[PDB]
Amino acid sequence: MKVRPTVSSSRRKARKAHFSAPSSVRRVIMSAPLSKELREKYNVRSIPIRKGDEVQIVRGAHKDKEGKVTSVYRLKYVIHVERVTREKATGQTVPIGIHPSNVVITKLHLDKDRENILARIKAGREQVAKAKGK
Amino acid sequence: RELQKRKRRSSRPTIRMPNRRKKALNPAGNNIIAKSWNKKETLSQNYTRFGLVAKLGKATGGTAPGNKALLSESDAVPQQQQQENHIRQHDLELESKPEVLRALEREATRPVEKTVRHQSEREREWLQRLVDKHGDDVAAMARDRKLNPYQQTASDIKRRLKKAGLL
Amino acid sequence: HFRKHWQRRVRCHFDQPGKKVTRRLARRAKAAALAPRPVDKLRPIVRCPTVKYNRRTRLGRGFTLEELKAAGIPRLLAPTIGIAVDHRRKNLSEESLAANVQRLKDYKARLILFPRK
Amino acid sequence: SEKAGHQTSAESWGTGRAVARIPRVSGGGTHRAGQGAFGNMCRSGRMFAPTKIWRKWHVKINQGQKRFATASALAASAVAPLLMARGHQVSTVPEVPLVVDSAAVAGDAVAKTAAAYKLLKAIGAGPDVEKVKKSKKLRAGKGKMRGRRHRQRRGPLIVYSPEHDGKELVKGFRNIPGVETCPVDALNLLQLAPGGHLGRFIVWTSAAIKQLDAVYESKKGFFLPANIVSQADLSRLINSTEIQSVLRAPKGEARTKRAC
RNA sequence: UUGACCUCGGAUCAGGUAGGAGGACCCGCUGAACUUAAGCAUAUCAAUAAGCGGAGGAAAAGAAACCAACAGGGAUUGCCCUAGUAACGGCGAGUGAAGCGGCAACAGCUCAAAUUUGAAAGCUGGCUUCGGCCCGCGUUGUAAUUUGGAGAGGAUGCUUUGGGCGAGGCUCCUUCUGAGUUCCCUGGAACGGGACGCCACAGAGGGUGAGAGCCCCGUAUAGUUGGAAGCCAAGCCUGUGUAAAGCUCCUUCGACGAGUCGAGUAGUUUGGGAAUGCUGCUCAAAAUGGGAGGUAAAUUUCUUCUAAAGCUAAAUACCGGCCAGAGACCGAUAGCGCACAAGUAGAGUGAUCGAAAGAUGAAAAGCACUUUGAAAAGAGGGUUAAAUAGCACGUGAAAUUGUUGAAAGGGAAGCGCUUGUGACCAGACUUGCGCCCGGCGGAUCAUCCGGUGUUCUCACCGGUGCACUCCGCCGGGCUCAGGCCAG
RNA sequence: GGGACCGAGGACCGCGCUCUGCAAGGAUGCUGGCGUAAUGGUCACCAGCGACCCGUCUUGAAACACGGACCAAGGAGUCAAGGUUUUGCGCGAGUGUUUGGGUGUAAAACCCGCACGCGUAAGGUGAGAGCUUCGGCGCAUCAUCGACC
RNA sequence: UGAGCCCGGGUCGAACGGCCUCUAGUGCAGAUCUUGGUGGUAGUAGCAAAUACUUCAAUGAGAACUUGAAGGACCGAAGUGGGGAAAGGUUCCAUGUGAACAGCGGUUGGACAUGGGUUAGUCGAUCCUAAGCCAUAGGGAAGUUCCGUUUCAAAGGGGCACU
RNA sequence: AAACUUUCAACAACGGAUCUCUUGGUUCUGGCAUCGAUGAAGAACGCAGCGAAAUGCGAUAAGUAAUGUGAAUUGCAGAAUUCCGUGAAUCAUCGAAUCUUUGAACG
């Protein structure tokens, strides 16, 4: 149950914020979970998705199929996974809009910024685990 | 209303005001009250733990059960069983229990330094000249015009001499 | 009794709990500022004026000059140590004088002073 | 809004025109021109008796009657059939006025939520908690649009002592659905008789019982009421020896034969 | 001849400031009528609406020329009662306070009247190497001291301090912090059902292809990363001048606001001709003075305050400003006129008036290709769970209309009662129970023994029972009861 | 002797008689066909009989007059203050917490100081409900004579 | 009995209901009611006068009102002619379309769409003042502002000089 | 018999009711006090590769500087980013600027 007066339980305001969020807030929203191997490798549950990530689609009509992210289309809250496409009437292939909450990350695109993000998430998680343990 | 519609229609962001207040709601600092204050408790509860009176007036309602913070004459003069024309003006000659109260008592009764005012250099040479020409006769020192141009009284001169150390 | 426009002059107290919370937060703001000190000043005991209410006493505005002098509390120090002063009131009676000096003696006995700096 | 329906300039056309004697909007270059206004039967018009903020939303109730109702709710909660009638699953629980040990309720050992759930399971509130949890579902109507999305049943009410049990059991609880907490020195009728129905399942503590006696002694201007009857068992009252001995002989049977 | 002072001017001189907007609330000015009542007139609406001027985050008011008559209270503001009382009203319509009392919040001060006269000690500029240099204002008075429940001056003896750094802290923004996408079924898609788990100071809310605590954002508490400005502040550097301050005593003093009070008069206003206040005109003050009350008390005794100069936070108001959180509210003819490129399209010379209009689909996957057609489109074909969703798009009523099916109809139709014809339908029944035989096949026949439970005499298990006793099936026979219409 | 319509009730009880039983406080027995659109029902039409177009308004009543092209949606005794009658509830010579204050899981709930609002600080004669130890006691209230202010 | 309640079949796609209390913007045939939609009348009234049209050929799917040629009529310099002022504002020109408008139609159009088009020392404005108006000096007015226009305004130019 | 008028049904039309939804309104509560000659409120004209309106901006014109974040924008077209980097973005913050004609509007 909410306690802090700053947060609001208003459905109207929550939906307005979600559907009028800017691109950075949309990135944070389109964060996606990591695989189990990455989970015990980095002590991180979820990370924002990006263009170079390899993901596994595990929800929707595409049962258990893998592929590299092609584009994170922040405008309609979808990502494009390589080779997950449907043919139009003309026979031209168009990518299928898939959701980061429906995908799971298998291989992670690594750079200094994302290494820092992983380090911060891990540091917080381990600090709280140590505080709870002792 | 038109301004609100304009804001909701424009792409400029909403200037969200942080919830700042003019006055703080809890004691702060490195003092006893600040270190012993509980912010999840109320004023009366904090003062009851401290052993202090918060309100010196009449009770405007029912308090909590544990609340302790809301308080021969020959001449036949009524003020005879009250005694213990000049009084001290800058302080009062005042004469099992909570830890905060005991700590406050110790800080209040803790000895303090005074920082005794000095006599200026020229005042010292002036007094020195007075005693060098007269010695200890403060009446002559006061009646002297060359060395005492301000015509200060003998009692004042004697007091300044005692403070200077020249008797 | 509605010959005037009470509709445009009508007021509702829907913020009674809000104002109660605001006033309580103001009293805590005063006690956060004046933390070891009481959040009020010592007020004298005064007899109510008319024949209807002269059998009872209440709290007055401030203590009189000569009753402060009899209590032994200097004038320029009383408002500083937290005693309200009323230069308009006259005692006119040893009964009021004695009651207020006894009250000030009780305040003296229960007061703690800190030595300047 | 007090300005609703009155932000227009309309005047009746007259009497002899073959149109309704209703105010009509002036103008002449829009759909709104010539249309009725200022009436409760007209589109985009004022409503009959517009709502006002001075509706007397609150009800003043005598504090003596409030205390009477609270006492009656406590007696009903003590009664066992009334819990079942109110809809509480109390069949694996003994001693309907449950008293759970304050040494087992006070501190972190209940401040942990899993521990509070384990205590409820051990004492027998598990059926009620599971009933609430399975009973959660969506509301029918506009409350979903107005912030009342779901609704569920109400579980046990936990009465404790802030000065003996220590107020942290609320945080240990406060997340189990349906389960509510309350201090003994301030009991709430909305919690004691939810929806106006008596017999809520309550778990107490020993300090709660002590302080319940203490607070009902400490109420000022109120004493525990005396009932207008002394024995509520009408079966014993009637079939007692005195009544039946002074009683007259029966004048007939329950179902009497018809003669003609 | 020259030089000062006074007064009045110039400058695109040096440096500043006002105008307008907003006006929800606030301070003033100005100022109605509709309405109600009454022979009539005053009154009421209303000291309101409209108009004009002026501020702020609040404004305004405010530290008694007050209230009282008591044992007195003690600046202002607001709430509760006082009270629909006093009071004024053809004692009509009616109008209509305040003292006391309970509470919220409380805070007190600055001048003018005195000579610094052993010392204009005061201040604006603009030139600066930032240290002090000049120009000036000002004696027709700028500092210090004092402001009448006071004060000054002397004497006297105690008691009082001033600056500059400043770790750190508080407030607010930010970084980070729990747990299933395990298995089966339906489904286009599980967020649905079932199974087994987990987290919970977090089961608020939202998104995700259908109802998700554990997929994602967030949500709870403690911390933690960096930043912002305000205030407090442990300590540390210094301090100075015969500098300032409080009190005490007294063979010395003690200045308090004028075209203002007041008197007459006119208008306006108030519950208020001791005029309730205000304004205009005429006259025009006082110093043991002046103002307001008390009082038959024997004379105007007594009581209580100092007006005509000024400042001041808080409790108070708020349809406007920057936000935030909520609701037993409304749900596209509703809710603001406006859920939409709405104060828009449009109308009026103009002041102004002022609408209608939301929804494909999870995803455009918004129909490739073939054929007819001048084309618009149609027909195949295709996407989709669905085209009985084709951007004339969720669902898709009635009024009204077309086609097909059946029927009726010699100057109205429609409606009630009762048949008949044709079409189309809901029920009811499908056998149940109990005895006589045989075949069986099994397990809980009676009684007794132990344990347990209970209504303390009833049961339940386990043993005993060994199958002319129980319990189910089959192949037969008979009884009773079974639907509709009738004799 | 012939015909028509009806069969309410559901162990026994009662009144009776013509009493091994009965026509006596309400129908049973025997039998047949069918067991399905057969009975029954709903629609449409025919047939015999019946049958002014609704509302408003006026009047003693009619007539006149007025409104009515059809459909969907909207649409009209509400809220507040002050009085007053009755019903329910709590306390009761008292009653009213919610001005305000104290807690709070925080517009909820719980608690309360001093005021304040409104109210409060003796019989006789005869009946009489209800009790009685059947000798009489005597509610409320009424009529009269009373007593007091 | 009734207001109504329940089920089946078809359509549809995301929430809804029974029971006990609470609450109200709670129940329609009328109000010459409001908004919207839809009928009969009804393919009915009606689509004017300016005398007048005809043949061939061309474009086009389609030609009475689109064009070329030929006839037959008309405005008759006080024009049915050629240019302007005011107002409008791209209507001008070329190409394309035929959804809507042009009381019929259209290949046509002042329609819709896409491009293009207005060149000045000598033409007009730009300069001057006319009737009249505004500011300034003053003076009214509670004030927004009013009177006032040469007024009892220190109001405008120019020159000379061995410094 | 057909046609026509009327009744009922099936399907198809007209129309947009019902149900469901809602980045909207309405009411209440809470923290805070900030327009303008350093040129406001308002009006106008310009600015995008392809834009009319809305929105943003002002010839530095759907914007520049700085800080933070950390890999986009999106209808199309063209460039990016080396990703082990002073760095994408119709991103956010925001302390520096640019800021056409008017409008209290001021040669």
Automatic annotation (TrEMBL), chain A:
Entry similarity comment: Belongs to the universal ribosomal protein uL24 family.
GO cellular component, one term: large ribosomal subunit
Organism for this UniProt entry: Chaetomium thermophilum (strain DSM 1495 / CBS 144.50 / IMI 039719) (Thermochaetoides thermophila)
Any GO MF annotation of the entry: structural constituent of ribosome
Record SUPFAM superfamilies: Translation proteins SH3-like domain
CDD domains: KOW_RPL26
Name of the protein this chain belongs to: 60S ribosomal protein L26-like protein
Residues annotated as transmembrane: none
Residue numbers spanned by region Disordered: 1-22
One GO BP annotation of this record: translation
Any single Pfam family the record assigns to this protein: Ribosomal_L26
From TrEMBL, chain B:
CC terms in the record's Gene Ontology section: nucleolus; ribonucleoprotein complex
One GO biological process term: ribosomal large subunit biogenesis
Membrane-spanning parts: none
Tagged with keyword Nucleus: yes
Residue segments, region Disordered: 1-22
Function statement: Involved in the biogenesis of the 60S ribosomal subunit.
Quaternary structure note: Component of the pre-66S ribosomal particle.
Family under the similarity heading: Belongs to the NOP16 family.
Protein name: Nucleolar protein 16
TrEMBL record, chain C:
Coiled coil: none
Keywords: Ribonucleoprotein, Ribosomal protein
Any GO BP: translation
GO cellular component: cytosolic large ribosomal subunit
GO molecular function: RNA binding; structural constituent of ribosome
Span of the signal peptide: none
Family: Belongs to the eukaryotic ribosomal protein eL13 family.
Protein name: 60S ribosomal protein L13
The species this protein was found in: Chaetomium thermophilum (strain DSM 1495 / CBS 144.50 / IMI 039719) (Thermochaetoides thermophila)
Full-sequence range covered: 13 to 129 of 213
UniProtKB/TrEMBL annotation, chain D:
GO molecular function: structural constituent of ribosome
Annotated region described as Disordered, given as residue ranges: 1-15
Domain of life of the organism encoding this protein: Eukaryota
Keywords for this protein: Ribonucleoprotein, Ribosomal protein
Presence of keyword Amino-acid biosynthesis: no
A GO CC annotation given for this chain: ribonucleoprotein complex
GO BP, sorted A to Z: translation
Protein family according to the UniProt entry: Belongs to the universal ribosomal protein uL4 family.
Full protein name: 60S ribosomal protein L4-like protein
Species of provenance: Chaetomium thermophilum (strain DSM 1495 / CBS 144.50 / IMI 039719) (Thermochaetoides thermophila)
Organism ancestry: Eukaryota, Fungi, Dikarya, Ascomycota, Pezizomycotina
Whole-protein coverage range: 54 to 313 of 365
